[PDB]
């Protein structure tokens, strides 16, 4: 019923700034999108960002309180951070990976992440449409 | 309009083996939940399987051709075949790169792709749904 | 006298999460442990967890400038922060790293610390009582 | 004519603790130097310090909207943050790299840097002076 | 109730020589306070020193078939042999690996060990008391 | 007072050949820049180039024995010559590299200096004006 | 009862070429081999080669569904295929790796083998004999 | 007298498809140079192309028992096939290795053959006129 | 005639110790199947045990004396030993090596042999049968 | 027209010294036959040889400033030298690499070329006439 | 005055066997000659081999107390023994490592010592004179 | 009867500078002990250095064309010359390679040589001695 959609640093900048890598969709407008998308599927979306560390690892952590799916998108922390794969370990309901960019197509340092091995699977490179597909992902498991 | 599902090496042999790591549903199977999803969005999809690298090349040379959308399962050529990414190269129209399993979460082998850097988008371990959301997204797009 | 035990991101978690991986003593029965345990070696223990880089950061700035050995378990920044280690290579007194696991028995990424350098020693895989037994050495130096 | 200087963890420290690694000139003493300087260049310096990524991300953000060149020394972040790479790419004005020591002197680990790459340049081991010569280089661009 | 400490090469050296890297506590001083702290802990410990890696096999042996705990400091071999670990891998009570000096803070073939991967936990750095505390832990488990 | 600068391989096309890369700023230029720029220092620049290593090793070995500072640009020796760095560890005034270009934005081979670890500091991508602002360096110390 | 025998690439050639590298017995002669020996066990052996790694999966294929033993030199696919590797993987029945040659005292990328970490046990060196002495094993269990 | 020319997987796309990379003359027209510059050397030229492995290892076969000359340009095969490469070790006549491009401008992928150590020599990034200068090559040997 | 296998560290424990990974097979049983198994072949069998390098060493320098063959099990020193590869680079007649485990399916520093490159021939994963099937080989050689 | 063929160290004592690795042919008549061969092409070929790094970017900046063609093997330097690289990336006119030995059958540091990926083309193996070859592209180009 | 040569694995076997890569000299001449030539300097030599670790490290340790200066040949353990670097890290007087062959023109694991960081020096490839070369250097220091 | 001692870049500097990793004996002082121990050994030695690569290459190209044997201690030439390499090839007298310091306690760029592989055999550490032993070894040679 009830999934959370994290997006960590940086996103909030979507849209407003380089459009050529990441689409001119805001990231008010992303929340448009996925909110619309979840009530046409029968869900629930709540989506949060941070560019927070800490706060990230907050929200993960209620998820795996009240056992709710994640979808998630962290940002450089995808690459980077050990203690954000800790807290999605915890997690007993999916956790989908999305990420905008084709991260396979960019530098190396994009091309590993410390969630892909513990995530239910990844979309990289649909554009915001990823976080989409993931919502019906959702929907019909 | 039209969208090729190319499927490779082994691929035939789905569901009627091993269901854990790849699910219960066959080949045949397979293909009837493609064509369904795809007429339900307005596209055709035409969904062909080899275990011969030489045949996989052939249908990706039409799809450059014909300028026709590929989604693209390369089973364990995905990992070892330059050839084929060449012939996808060529592709001007979108190729969505889809594994049934999570291969980030199996050997160090599975977790390179020759084809992941020339790709629009991968989609990895959301099971037979990943070719259905390959196919939403084209729909879109 | 003064002894600082520091716990770093997803330490807060303990005990009501995964007891397989790092038993079921909660980190408030940990505090009480540890209080109870300095009491009875003649010292004061101050714990202190957070998720937050800069806050255990801020810690360790005042354990450097009041002279004070700390005990560190910095949870994943362990593997990833050399940050927390430039704060810790001010400390004129010791430091004493812990982990809970064995994190030489789990991914290679775990075995690698920003922190073993420069730390008088290192504890790890004795659970709970790690940080029992750095107090004692504390103690008897 | 405005040029922001940030400084990232663990430089709040400076002068106080190791004169020997990184001079006995603190941090207010900097703050002073570099505005002195730069009103000798006919420029306004704002000089901004934090333990905090997101903070630091915060002040990015605001040079990137603004226009306004950066004077970047992130600290151990340096080696680590991809997402304080992600918004120092947003800068369409030049960024300017700076570290007090010599990190290709010191251990391996701080001889990478992932901000190097996309920066204008990079000023190293020529301690405080270092922001004052990337003032010198703004202002004559 | 009876926990073996093995030492192996270069430790009967120990007090004698080096006090710099390795303390000025000699081989027979080391074995009589671990008797002493073992009695006082309720447990028997049973000291054996080898330069010669068959006695050391030899003794580990005898633990595994007397179900006993070890604690061992194996000297080089603990970087080098995989007939030491082949043999503790039939233990299955404790094994705590011991170093006196703090092995991650000096050579980089130090910093690996064959050992530590099939250990219960391991402490280094912490000098001779590192034996004494892990005879601690084993009385407490 | 007395300033070398050294140039290595093919700076003496400076400004005649590529611009877009290194400006258009020629070596004999570049000379009356640095000269007059000492001058206002109150320093003496003496600049000298060569393409050949044996010439570079006389310029610092005088250097070496006149105790004088140098500015280095070594070219493409910056990368891989050992002598040119033994003849460099030699002095006992201060060395600063320089380099044109940002060497971390271009090819891998680019980021490894011989002379990086040994020098007093580096500048690099400011351009010509890096030479400049080497000097003032050099002024103030 | 049933064991099968599949030769991968180039193994057709025997006999009639290089007998320096794998000995002067023909491909034909290394069938009636085979024959002979299983006969003289109580087995029936069944033996194929293809240059075709498509034929090969085939062949594999059917081992899987009937449950039968299979004997696989793979030739130059050994260190290649991961196709090979995940027709393989479906084996409920002992998998025998067989080389001719000594592989491990050959090329660099002759001595790792997609197929040896999911075979029951591997033979190499032994010549033509290696197919006899697998045939041997698999009568006894 | 006769040279055998053999393509691998993608050359029979050429010219049609990207010229940019490859040049504008198609597979056709590359046989009809070749053999007209084959009969101006004295020589007969056979040209053949296939996209199937199989097909190329059984051309390579006839090329050694003919003991006749081969001018290879393998395509994707060149990186990958340790099966084409034992193929071609059996020749006892020159093999000359041509690609179009200049594979080592290209992917660090590309900059590596299984051909390239057992080929007499090796021509790269000349285009179309790699292959005439081999047939030059092969007359004057 | 005479053939000599030499077992090395923990080899003695066969059997007795884990079943799992080695089978119920002990070591007195071990001879006692390869000296009957030898007498079957013509042969005499001479088996010998040590956890002892420098025996170990002393048995290879006996069989190289007398020209004679030798199937090893070197244990953990297959892995480890220089000395071990030095001795059996002396041997005239062939040297078999022998691994119980499929060493290809375990532990990374398992696939590594400092033997494999000069031995003739190399079984692994086949049990205890392995050292069978050598004699097998040596009787037919 | 004009077409500078450049020979690195050690290329005068071609022919004279070892045969075997690189024909009977000296350096003076290697410059009579490309002279020869020019001719024939309707080209002026210039040929220069020294072992002086110095003298060959001297030729190599006169080839820049002339719009030349360069053939360039520059022996050891090939694997060496980025300054023979930075000189060469100056060239508009075509640059092709010729190397008389097969460069990629030989050792491993052979096996890289500073030169090779800003080439037009590579030539290796054919020996002299690889010179010769290269000649007839310029005059065809 | 007194001289320890000592001898690890193999080197017994010396002259008696393979004089290709050794010479013929035996192990019983070798001492012979390092004696006379001891005599001749001025000095004792005491020359001891064992294939035995602990041995070895017993004869180290004596030379340690005893503050005797070592010439070592460790034969296998120079590539492998942390224990006898270990040992040898104790010697106050010099030490000088001594191979006969030379062994940085053999295997890549030859080209590692664990003795040379912390030996005077060392010769390799100088055969049997490599001894009495050392001799004289410790008699002239 | 003739030896040639060649000495590479900074070898001049000898003994005038840093006495602490050289030692300080000057070049000329070199020169008359290399000849007084040459005379006393029956040989004649002529002695040269120089900072030029190409000079070493001549000298060396001479002692090829003479069959004369040559010390050399190419300074940091011996590290990264493929050309110096080459010329020392040629030579058909013993190569023996010599340097003052212990170059493998230093620099990991030290630790590697491209003349030892091809040198009869290497000195080093034992400082200016060194070349004598080299002397000493040819005359009983
Ligand atoms: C400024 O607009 C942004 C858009 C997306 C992102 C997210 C991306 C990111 O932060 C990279 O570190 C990462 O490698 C990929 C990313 O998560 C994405 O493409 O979704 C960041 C900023
Ligand atoms: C026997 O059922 C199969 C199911 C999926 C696959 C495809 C997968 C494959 O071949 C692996 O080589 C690859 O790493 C992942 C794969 O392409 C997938 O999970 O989709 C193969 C056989
Ligand atoms: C949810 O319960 C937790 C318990 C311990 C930890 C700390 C561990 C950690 O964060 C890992 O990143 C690290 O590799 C080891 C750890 O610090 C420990 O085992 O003490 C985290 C969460
Ligand atoms: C306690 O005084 C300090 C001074 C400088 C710094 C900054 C440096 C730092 O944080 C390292 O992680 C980095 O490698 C270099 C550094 O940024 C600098 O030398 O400017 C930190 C603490
Ligand atoms: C001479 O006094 C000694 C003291 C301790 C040791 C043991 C140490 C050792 O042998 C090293 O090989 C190892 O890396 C660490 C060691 O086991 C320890 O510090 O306990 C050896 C000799
Ligand atoms: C043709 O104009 C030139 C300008 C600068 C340089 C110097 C640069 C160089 O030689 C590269 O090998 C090096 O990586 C960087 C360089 O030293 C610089 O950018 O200053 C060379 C040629
Ligand atoms: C031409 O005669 C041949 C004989 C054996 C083989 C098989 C071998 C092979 O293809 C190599 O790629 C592989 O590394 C080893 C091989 O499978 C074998 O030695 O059995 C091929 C050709
Ligand atoms: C679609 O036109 C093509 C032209 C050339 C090739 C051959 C090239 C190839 O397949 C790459 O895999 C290879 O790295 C280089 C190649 O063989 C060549 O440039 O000749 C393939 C397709
Ligand atoms: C306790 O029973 C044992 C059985 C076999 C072995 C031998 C194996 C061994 O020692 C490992 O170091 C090696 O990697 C493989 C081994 O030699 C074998 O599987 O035969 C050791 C102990
Ligand atoms: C002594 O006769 C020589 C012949 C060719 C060369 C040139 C070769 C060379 O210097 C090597 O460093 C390089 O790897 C290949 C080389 O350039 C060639 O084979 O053309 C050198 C000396
Ligand atoms: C059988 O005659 C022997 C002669 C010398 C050696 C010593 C050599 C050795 O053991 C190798 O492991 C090592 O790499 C070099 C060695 O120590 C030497 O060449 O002196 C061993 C056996
Ligand atoms: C300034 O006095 C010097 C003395 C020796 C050397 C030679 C050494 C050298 O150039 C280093 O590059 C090399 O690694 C070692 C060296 O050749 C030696 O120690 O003999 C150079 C300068």
Same mark, same amino acid.
């Given at each position: 019923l009830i999934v959370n959609v994290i997006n960590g640093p940086n996103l909030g900048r979507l849209g407003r700034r380089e459009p050529a890598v990441? &689409? &001119? /969709? /805001?990231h008010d407008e992303l929340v448009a999108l996925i909110e619309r998308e979840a009530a046409e599927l029968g869900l629930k979306a709540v989506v949060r960002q941070s560019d927070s560390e800490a706060q990230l690892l907050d929200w993960i952590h209620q998820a795996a309180d009240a056992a709710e799916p994640v979808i998630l @998108? =962290? &940002?450089? #922390? /995808? $690459? /980077?951070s050990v203690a954000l794969r800790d807290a999605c370990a915890e997690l007993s309901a999916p956790l989908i990976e999305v990420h905008i960019? @084709?991260?396979? =197509?960019?530098?190396?340092? *994009? *091309? $590993?992440?410390?969630?892909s091995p513990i995530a239910t699977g990844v979309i990289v490179? #649909?554009?915001?449409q990823g976080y989409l597909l993931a919502l019906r992902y959702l929907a019909e498991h």
């Open positions: 990441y &689409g &001119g /969709t /805001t @998108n =962290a &940002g450089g #922390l /995808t $690459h /980077t960019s @084709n991260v396979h =197509a960019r530098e190396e340092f *994009r *091309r $590993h992440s410390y969630l490179g #649909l554009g915001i």
